[PDB]
Scaffold this motif. Structure first.
Motif, PDB file in Angstrom:
ATOM      1  N   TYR A 185     -33.095  35.629  -3.022  1.00 53.88           N
ATOM      2  CA  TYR A 185     -34.421  35.911  -2.498  1.00 53.88           C
ATOM      3  C   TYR A 185     -34.481  37.198  -1.697  1.00 53.88           C
ATOM      4  O   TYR A 185     -35.546  37.535  -1.176  1.00 53.88           O
ATOM      5  CB  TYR A 185     -34.899  34.752  -1.628  1.00 53.88           C
ATOM      6  N   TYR A 186     -33.378  37.920  -1.584  1.00 55.15           N
ATOM      7  CA  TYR A 186     -33.298  39.087  -0.725  1.00 55.15           C
ATOM      8  C   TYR A 186     -32.898  40.307  -1.531  1.00 55.15           C
ATOM      9  O   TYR A 186     -32.060  40.224  -2.430  1.00 55.15           O
ATOM     10  CB  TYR A 186     -32.292  38.872   0.391  1.00 55.15           C
ATOM     11  N   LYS A 187     -33.506  41.438  -1.202  1.00 53.51           N
ATOM     12  CA  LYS A 187     -33.057  42.707  -1.744  1.00 53.51           C
ATOM     13  C   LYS A 187     -32.020  43.363  -0.849  1.00 53.51           C
ATOM     14  O   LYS A 187     -31.145  44.077  -1.345  1.00 53.51           O
ATOM     15  CB  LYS A 187     -34.250  43.640  -1.939  1.00 53.51           C
ATOM     16  N   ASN A 188     -32.094  43.125   0.461  1.00 49.65           N
ATOM     17  CA  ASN A 188     -31.118  43.625   1.428  1.00 49.65           C
ATOM     18  C   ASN A 188     -30.676  42.441   2.278  1.00 49.65           C
ATOM     19  O   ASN A 188     -31.129  42.270   3.408  1.00 49.65           O
ATOM     20  CB  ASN A 188     -31.714  44.731   2.273  1.00 49.65           C
ATOM     21  N   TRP A 189     -29.762  41.638   1.737  1.00 50.75           N
ATOM     22  CA  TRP A 189     -29.277  40.471   2.462  1.00 50.75           C
ATOM     23  C   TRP A 189     -28.425  40.865   3.655  1.00 50.75           C
ATOM     24  O   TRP A 189     -28.462  40.193   4.689  1.00 50.75           O
ATOM     25  CB  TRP A 189     -28.482  39.573   1.518  1.00 50.75           C
ATOM     26  N   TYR A 190     -27.659  41.947   3.533  1.00 50.72           N
ATOM     27  CA  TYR A 190     -26.704  42.300   4.576  1.00 50.72           C
ATOM     28  C   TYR A 190     -27.406  42.646   5.882  1.00 50.72           C
ATOM     29  O   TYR A 190     -26.916  42.304   6.962  1.00 50.72           O
ATOM     30  CB  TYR A 190     -25.818  43.453   4.111  1.00 50.72           C
ATOM     31  N   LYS A 191     -28.543  43.331   5.810  1.00 49.47           N
ATOM     32  CA  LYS A 191     -29.302  43.667   7.005  1.00 49.47           C
ATOM     33  C   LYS A 191     -30.351  42.629   7.359  1.00 49.47           C
ATOM     34  O   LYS A 191     -30.970  42.737   8.420  1.00 49.47           O
ATOM     35  CB  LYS A 191     -29.989  45.022   6.839  1.00 49.47           C
ATOM     36  N   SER A 192     -30.565  41.635   6.509  1.00 45.93           N
ATOM     37  CA  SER A 192     -31.615  40.669   6.756  1.00 45.93           C
ATOM     38  C   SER A 192     -31.208  39.710   7.866  1.00 45.93           C
ATOM     39  O   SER A 192     -30.052  39.651   8.287  1.00 45.93           O
ATOM     40  CB  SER A 192     -31.928  39.889   5.487  1.00 45.93           C
ATOM     41  N   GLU A 193     -32.185  38.953   8.348  1.00 47.87           N
ATOM     42  CA  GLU A 193     -31.911  37.868   9.275  1.00 47.87           C
ATOM     43  C   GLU A 193     -31.542  36.580   8.564  1.00 47.87           C
ATOM     44  O   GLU A 193     -31.244  35.587   9.235  1.00 47.87           O
ATOM     45  CB  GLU A 193     -33.117  37.632  10.180  1.00 47.87           C
ATOM     46  N   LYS A 194     -31.560  36.578   7.232  1.00 47.34           N
ATOM     47  CA  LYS A 194     -31.181  35.418   6.433  1.00 47.34           C
ATOM     48  C   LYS A 194     -31.980  34.188   6.839  1.00 47.34           C
ATOM     49  O   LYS A 194     -31.457  33.078   6.925  1.00 47.34           O
ATOM     50  CB  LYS A 194     -29.681  35.158   6.530  1.00 47.34           C
ATOM     51  N   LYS A 195     -33.266  34.389   7.088  1.00 45.84           N
ATOM     52  CA  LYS A 195     -34.121  33.317   7.565  1.00 45.84           C
ATOM     53  C   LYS A 195     -34.788  32.549   6.437  1.00 45.84           C
ATOM     54  O   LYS A 195     -35.572  31.639   6.712  1.00 45.84           O
ATOM     55  CB  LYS A 195     -35.179  33.877   8.518  1.00 45.84           C
ATOM     56  N   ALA A 196     -34.494  32.879   5.186  1.00 43.99           N
ATOM     57  CA  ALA A 196     -35.090  32.164   4.069  1.00 43.99           C
ATOM     58  C   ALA A 196     -34.558  30.742   3.995  1.00 43.99           C
ATOM     59  O   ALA A 196     -33.387  30.487   4.281  1.00 43.99           O
ATOM     60  CB  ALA A 196     -34.807  32.890   2.759  1.00 43.99           C
ATOM     61  N   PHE A 197     -35.435  29.814   3.616  1.00 39.80           N
ATOM     62  CA  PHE A 197     -35.068  28.417   3.394  1.00 39.80           C
ATOM     63  C   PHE A 197     -34.461  27.784   4.638  1.00 39.80           C
ATOM     64  O   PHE A 197     -33.643  26.870   4.543  1.00 39.80           O
ATOM     65  CB  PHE A 197     -34.104  28.283   2.217  1.00 39.80           C
ATOM     66  N   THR A 198     -34.850  28.261   5.815  1.00 37.61           N
ATOM     67  CA  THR A 198     -34.249  27.793   7.054  1.00 37.61           C
ATOM     68  C   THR A 198     -35.012  26.647   7.692  1.00 37.61           C
ATOM     69  O   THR A 198     -34.392  25.743   8.255  1.00 37.61           O
ATOM     70  CB  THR A 198     -34.138  28.937   8.057  1.00 37.61           C
ATOM     71  N   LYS A 199     -36.339  26.654   7.628  1.00 30.79           N
ATOM     72  CA  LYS A 199     -37.118  25.608   8.267  1.00 30.79           C
ATOM     73  C   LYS A 199     -38.020  24.841   7.317  1.00 30.79           C
ATOM     74  O   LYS A 199     -38.779  23.981   7.773  1.00 30.79           O
ATOM     75  CB  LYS A 199     -37.954  26.190   9.409  1.00 30.79           C
ATOM     76  N   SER A 200     -37.966  25.116   6.022  1.00 32.47           N
ATOM     77  CA  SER A 200     -38.676  24.301   5.050  1.00 32.47           C
ATOM     78  C   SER A 200     -37.818  23.174   4.506  1.00 32.47           C
ATOM     79  O   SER A 200     -38.316  22.350   3.735  1.00 32.47           O
ATOM     80  CB  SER A 200     -39.165  25.164   3.890  1.00 32.47           C
ATOM     81  N   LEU A 201     -36.546  23.120   4.886  1.00 30.21           N
ATOM     82  CA  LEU A 201     -35.623  22.138   4.343  1.00 30.21           C
ATOM     83  C   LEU A 201     -35.506  20.887   5.196  1.00 30.21           C
ATOM     84  O   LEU A 201     -35.061  19.852   4.690  1.00 30.21           O
ATOM     85  CB  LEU A 201     -34.237  22.763   4.171  1.00 30.21           C
ATOM     86  N   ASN A 202     -35.896  20.951   6.469  1.00 28.75           N
ATOM     87  CA  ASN A 202     -35.848  19.798   7.356  1.00 28.75           C
ATOM     88  C   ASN A 202     -37.149  19.009   7.359  1.00 28.75           C
ATOM     89  O   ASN A 202     -37.476  18.364   8.363  1.00 28.75           O
ATOM     90  CB  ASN A 202     -35.492  20.241   8.774  1.00 28.75           C
ATOM     91  N   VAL A 203     -37.906  19.051   6.268  1.00 37.12           N
ATOM     92  CA  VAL A 203     -39.159  18.309   6.170  1.00 37.12           C
ATOM     93  C   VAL A 203     -38.843  16.819   6.116  1.00 37.12           C
ATOM     94  O   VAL A 203     -37.796  16.428   5.580  1.00 37.12           O
ATOM     95  CB  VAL A 203     -39.977  18.751   4.947  1.00 37.12           C
ATOM     96  N   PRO A 204     -39.700  15.961   6.664  1.00 35.86           N
ATOM     97  CA  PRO A 204     -39.405  14.526   6.664  1.00 35.86           C
ATOM     98  C   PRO A 204     -39.336  13.967   5.253  1.00 35.86           C
ATOM     99  O   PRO A 204     -40.019  14.431   4.339  1.00 35.86           O
ATOM    100  CB  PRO A 204     -40.573  13.920   7.449  1.00 35.86           C
ATOM    101  N   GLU A 205     -38.493  12.949   5.090  1.00 32.20           N
ATOM    102  CA  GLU A 205     -38.281  12.340   3.785  1.00 32.20           C
ATOM    103  C   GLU A 205     -39.534  11.674   3.237  1.00 32.20           C
ATOM    104  O   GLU A 205     -39.644  11.498   2.019  1.00 32.20           O
ATOM    105  CB  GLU A 205     -37.148  11.321   3.873  1.00 32.20           C
ATOM    106  N   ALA A 206     -40.472  11.289   4.102  1.00 31.84           N
ATOM    107  CA  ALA A 206     -41.691  10.645   3.627  1.00 31.84           C
ATOM    108  C   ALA A 206     -42.495  11.585   2.740  1.00 31.84           C
ATOM    109  O   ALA A 206     -42.977  11.190   1.673  1.00 31.84           O
ATOM    110  CB  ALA A 206     -42.529  10.170   4.813  1.00 31.84           C
TER     111      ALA A 206
END
Lengths: 96, 380
Positions: free
Chosen positions: B117-138
């Motif tokens: 998902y990144y064109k410049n991963w090395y300089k990125s904050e790597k914040k992709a997929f960080t807070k959409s994955l802890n969604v409740p199981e319901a």
RNA sequence: UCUGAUGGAGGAUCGAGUUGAUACUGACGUGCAAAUCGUUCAUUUCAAUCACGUUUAGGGGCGAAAGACUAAUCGAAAAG
RNA sequence: UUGUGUUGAAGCGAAAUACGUGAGUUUUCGUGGAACAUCUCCCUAGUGCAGAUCUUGGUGGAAGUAGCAACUAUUCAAAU
RNA sequence: AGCGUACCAACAACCGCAUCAGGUCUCCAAGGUUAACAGCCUCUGGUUAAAUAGAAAAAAGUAGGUAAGGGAAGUCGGCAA
RNA sequence: CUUUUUCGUGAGCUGAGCUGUGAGCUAGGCAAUAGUUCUUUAACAACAAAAAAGAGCACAAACUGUAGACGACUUUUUUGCCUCAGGGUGCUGUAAACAUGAAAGUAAACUUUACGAUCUGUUGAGGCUUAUCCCUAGUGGUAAAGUGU
């Protein structure tokens, strides 16, 4: 202000160029490599190093060269590249 | 007036325009038709073109000039490290085509996956997929229930693991593999139980099976009409060169037709070849991946000196009969056959007699480095 | 009559140069060039080649003859 | 004949609640810096341009394009 | 006695509209190989300059090379090689 | 607008009471005026200012070469990458040097010494091998930090 003893594989640098450009291309590649290594725009190649590179005519420069890069203080930083006469190129690496 | 001598046109109009492909990754245009009766199963896989070798097999074709004799055949090696399933996407039919209902991700995704998902991963904050994955199981279960109720085509997002390959690339190739099989109730649970674990090739494919290969051909830059379309060279006396088409159209229509061959890009084209037979599915674990029962030697698929321009195959692989489009390191997507084939070649059970692992650089005479050193004896 | 030498004839032969210009109907053809470049080709003791000087002037000259040439002008030059 | 001009003429650029049907005429602003008109009537002519592969001069799109290609080949350091 | 006496002679000093790959008369004439003042390399003398450079290096062009097996079936014609 | 009231819904409260809202019931008086019309300024959407409440990337750069006329495309930027080295794998074909080594023969001294194409041993040696080959947390390095949002 540092000194480095490094070896350049001129074969892979002049591999593509034609006969008439092999030695000048080698010279240009040494200048570029020294500039990149020492982060200086002002790179001066020693006359003896030029003589060594041209020693076999324009057709084939030496495959490898051992050079000594040295930074000197006097935009202000510059580097001087000298030939290092070695008997063999085996087993020797980049030194600082 | 009419042509004095008729002859078929040059090149196929069905592969037009011969333009550069959008992407390096092979894209499945269509998956095989869904069969309700069969159990849920994956349909496609991804690997990388490592190179090719040749094998010896005993032919079992009665009434053929070959039959009982042993035959050498060229075979392509596609390194296939296990894919990782990370997502589920549900489709529903509309008069405007297939519409995504939603995509459901797994609780954890690899950094290799997130790199895509990144064109410049090395300089990125790597914040992709960080807070959409802890969604409740319901909400997860709600989305899956709606997919079950409304969707009719299910695909699983899965990605490769280039870190297990000699590739310089670090970002994973991700693609959706359609699940074909039972009802959506079974499809959803079949993918959910595999929503994070590795997907080995052996699950998707079986040996002696015909598959299709989707990949981007080897690029050649812009090429002349002689190379690009195979037109005949003009005679040596031609004034302004001979490597061209002489007449590029009649006077009328007062235009150039699109069927006229012209210079342009050659190679780097998307292609989908059918009917490549899997000769062997070699496993990472075993040390006899390249050994046959008629060879009993201890050797792996990688030839001595490594696969040229690729490296060493340290993971699962499949030996594919014939050649496949693309260079070395090219990602090849293997797809299950659109309709199962009942032909003799499709149903044949190949018995590999010998797999060659001699050096592919130069002309190798030995199968193993041990054999080489034994032959030459001590040196300086 | 025959044989071996000697001898060095020829609008003799090959061939650089010189003098030309066969072919590629090559390049170029908004050229390096209002005729060039490359390769190929013809020619080299003679009816040979070159320079300077000198003669012949326009319905005239000169022509191993192509209506050729006579200052990028010729089935009648150029200037007024 | 009877008028306009350094309190700015001719010319020129833009115009006008302007007149004419129209060639045009007349005004305003700006520029200009020295001449101008006469429609009172008439006399006179080198008197009216879109073209003529028109003449002379100037300027375009093409276009930052074609191109800057024979003669094997340049490199290092220094001076100015 | 008088007159000429510098310099170019083409590579930019001449004629081709030009600092034009054209044309333009004469003399001197080393070594090696060789029949040879040929070709190729070299010493003395001269030059490293050409209306440009750098990089990349695909199509196409142009000047060349090499091509399995066949050997003129190509083409008006063995043109070109 | 005031009085009498009836029935439904929102805030807050604990199936339930109250307030507000909507509709109605009985009774009372209370307003419109711009000179004859010039569209009946009446809709929707947006924006600006001022108040109240809640709220990271990409390019460039260096690298790559699965790409390429140039753009573009594939990559990496500190378990990576570049570099050199080591190893592998190959290509060529046995390096320089030395040898009271050989060598068809030759000449020169009182048995040895000189010349010798070439050959042999050390020597499957030496050289080369990614520049678009393979492996190695092996060496050294990995730079200024500019532009847009």
């Amino acid at each position: 202000p540092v000194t480095k003893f490094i070896t350049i594989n001129l074969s892979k640098l002049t591999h593509k160029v034609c006969y008439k450009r092999k030695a000048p291309r080698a010279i240009k590649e040494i200048r570029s490599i020294a500039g990149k290594l020492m982060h200086t725009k002002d790179v001066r190649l020693d006359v003896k190093l030029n003589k060594f590179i041209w020693s076999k005519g324009v057709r084939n420069p030496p495959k490898r060269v051992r050079v000594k890069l040295e930074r000197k203080r006097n935009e202000k930083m510059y580097t001087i590249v000298e030939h290092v006469m070695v008997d063999s190129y085996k087993g020797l690496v980049n030194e600082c | 007036s009419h042509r004095k001598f008729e002859r078929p046109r040059h090149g196929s109009l069905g592969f037009l325009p011969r333009k550069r492909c959008k992407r390096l990754r092979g894209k499945i245009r269509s998956f095989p038709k869904d069969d309700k009766e069969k159990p849920p199963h994956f349909t496609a896989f991804m690997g990388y073109k490592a190179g090719m070798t040749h094998i010896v097999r005993e032919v079992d074709k009665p009434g053929s000039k070959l039959h009982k004799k042993e035959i050498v055949e060229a075979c392509t090696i596609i390194e296939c490290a296990p894919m990782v399933v990370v997502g589920i996407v549900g489709y529903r039919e509309t008069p405007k085509g297939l519409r995504i209902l939603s995509t459901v991700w797994a609780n954890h995704v690899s950094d290799e996956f997130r790199r895509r998902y990144y064109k410049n991963w090395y300089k990125s904050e790597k914040k992709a997929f960080t807070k959409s994955l802890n969604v409740p199981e319901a909400t997860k279960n709600c989305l899956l229930k709606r997919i079950e109720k409304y969707c009719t085509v299910l695909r699983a997002i899965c990605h490769t693991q280039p870190s297990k390959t000699p590739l310089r690339m670090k970002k994973a190739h991700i693609m959706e593999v359609q699940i074909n099989g039972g009802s959506m109730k079974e499809k959803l649970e079949f993918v959910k139980e595999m929503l994070e674990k590795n997907l080995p090739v052996s699950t998707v494919f079986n040996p002696n099976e015909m598959i299709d290969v989707i990949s981007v051909t080897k690029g050649h830059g812009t090429k002349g009409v002689v190379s690009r379309y195979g037109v005949k060279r003009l005679p040596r006396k031609t004034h302004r060169g001979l490597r061209k088409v002489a007449c590029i159209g009649a006077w009328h229509p007062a235009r150039v037709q699109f069927q006229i061959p012209r210079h342009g890009q050659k190679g780097y084209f998307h292609r989908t070849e059918r009917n490549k037979k899997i000769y062997r599915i070699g496993l990472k674990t075993d040390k006899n991946s390249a050994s046959t029962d008629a060879d009993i030697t201890e050797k792996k698929i990688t030839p001595m000196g490594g696969f040229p321009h690729y490296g060493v195959v340290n993971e699962d692989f499949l030996l594919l009969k014939g050649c496949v489009a693309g260079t070395k390191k090219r990602p090849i997507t293997l797809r299950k056959n659109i309709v199962p084939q009942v032909s003799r070649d499709a149903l044949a059970q190949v018995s590999l007699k010998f797999i060659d692992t001699s050096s592919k650089i130069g002309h190798g005479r030995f199968q193993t480095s041990e054999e080489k050193v034994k032959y030459y004896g001590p040196l300086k």
